[PDB]
RNA sequence: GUGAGCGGCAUCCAAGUUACGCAUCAGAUUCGAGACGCGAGUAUUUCCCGCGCGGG
């Protein structure tokens, strides 16, 4: 690690004011009243994963040839 | 088929109310528009400066 990992953080939801127009006007067929934000399809989700800034390195027995060629499209 | 693949930190909120750049301080002390332009000196050549002629 060239730095500390970071714990990255990211979300999902959908837009609720979206999804009750789209209730009220017929593009989406929802009998539910409300939404769930702690589950179901609306449920809003809080997750987290770390992030690096490294240097891979790692050893193999093998043709050097292709496998720099099958890296070179990675 | 990279413990991969898939995933909105997003929604809402007034920096605002009140507050004298003000009080005081000599542009003063001295001195003339009144003075300053030649009626000043003999007769015919003398040492010389540029070179017959210009010129001490």
Known sequence: ??????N???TSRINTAE????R????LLLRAAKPNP????????????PLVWA???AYCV???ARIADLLSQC
């Open 38 to 49: 702690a589950g179901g399809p609306f449920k809003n989700s809080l997750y987290h994963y």
């Open 1 to 6: 690690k060239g730095a500390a990992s970071q």
């Open 19 to 22: 999804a009750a127009r789209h």
């Open 62 to 64: 093998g043709d050097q």
């Open 8 to 10: 990255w953080m990211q």
């Open 55 to 57: 240097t891979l390195t």
């Open 24 to 27: 009220s006007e017929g593009f």
